[PDB]
Amino acid sequence: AKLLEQIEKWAAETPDQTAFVWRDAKITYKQLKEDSDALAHWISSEYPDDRSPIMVYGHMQPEMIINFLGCVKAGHAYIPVDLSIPADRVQRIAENSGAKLLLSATAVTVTDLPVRIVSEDNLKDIFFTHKGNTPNPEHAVKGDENFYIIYTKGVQITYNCLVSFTKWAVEDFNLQTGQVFLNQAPFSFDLSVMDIYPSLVTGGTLWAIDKDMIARPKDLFASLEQSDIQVWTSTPSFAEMCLMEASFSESMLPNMKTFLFCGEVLPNEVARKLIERFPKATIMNTYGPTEATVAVTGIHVTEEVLDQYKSLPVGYCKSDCRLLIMKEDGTIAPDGEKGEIVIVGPSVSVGYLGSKAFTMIDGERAYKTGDAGYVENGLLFYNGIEHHLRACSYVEGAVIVPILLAVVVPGEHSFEKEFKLTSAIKKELNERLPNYMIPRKFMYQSSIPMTPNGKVDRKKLLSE
């Protein structure tokens, strides 16, 4: 049925089941339906014909999801804005997007925004004032109408784009029903969509972790231990950070069944370690730009895949879409050859809000990713040494950053001086790589730093 119908179905079938939980704050499918219905009814009464996007500001409060649903149920696309987004950027969105309203799941800090701000208590008053009211079914966003706009430039993701992505994920990733889904990515990062919607349409439970938790491993693991998470969606880096914890394995999350990765490169070793620690789980690696609705390719990372590849492939393209590897010139690269990845089909966004990259191919929307890659027998390899670096002795983790800078988290070793560990690693690397490919500069860290979205913090590494 409809995306929204698929969700409300659970409000009827399992009304008391938790739809979302953040620390002590929880909301059941019934509460989600009531409050989002209340919000939507209010939005419609306040804005009779306006259908401008609506900003939803906060971090991990349940009201984030409630607001998302209220906006779309009233025919307005929501624009998620996490607290970690820089104030001037938030302001630029306030002017760029054309939004006239902002709903807050906390205390709005970014002062003076050219938009009507509906704070936390003002938000509670509307859930109360419109309690029991339901929105006009015809107001719900549909077809090629915007559902959400996530900034990267505001990427317009339609109802049809989301549906195309959500059905593929639930079906191909073999998600059940009633499973607990981890949410690590802030909502301002579309990776979050890979868990939010497949969970809501399958009656799962979203277990959100937050910034403060991540900054305190004891807190993070305490939460994970009680989560009973079954479907883990995060960036490779966040999982790698969790793997540094020796107790992060099956015994901690006995019911883990599906790891879903996207956002950056998933190291072969990381995937191998996950497999060793969670023998009952299936690991899925995926790829896609924000402009193609979260992800378009996917592949089950098996022992086989780990063995025949060094850098892991990013998968097979969902069939209602297609990938084209383009050499410099509208000429398609022969299979196996490198070129720019181009995506075409229903997952492709309708374009940047306002305002090169979007085009039309064979009558369908297409997007030039600006990403290099190549395909072999339908298998996509994404290309933006690290694999060989990670495999070296004394290296427990590493990332290569082109300025080439090798950043490595050293494991136990016996070297008294840094330059001696560096020479040893280089000597080892020279065994599998020509000398000119070995990074000149090496830097050591206790751990690879991540941005608030969970990706490798390149900027920070360069600054250091």
Numbering used by the authors: 1 to 152, 160 to 362, 368 to 396, 414 to 432, 441 to 501
Kindly provide excerpts from the paper associated with this entry.
In the first adenylation reaction, D-alanine is converted into DltA-bound D-alanine adenylate (D-Ala-AMP). In the subsequent thiolation reaction, the activated alanyl group in the intermediate is transferred to the thiol group of DltC-linked 4’-phosphopantetheine (DltC-SH). D-alanylation brings in positively charged amino-groups and partially neutralizes the net negative charges of the phosphate groups on the lipoteichoic acid backbone.
We also determined the structure of BcDltA in the absence of any substrate. Asp-399, equivalent to Asp-398 in BsDltA, serves as the hinge residue for domain rotation. This structural feature of BcDltA likely explains the relatively low sub-millimolar affinity for ATP, since part of the stabilizing BcDltA-ATP interactions would be used to compensate the cost of establishing the adenylation conformation of the protein.
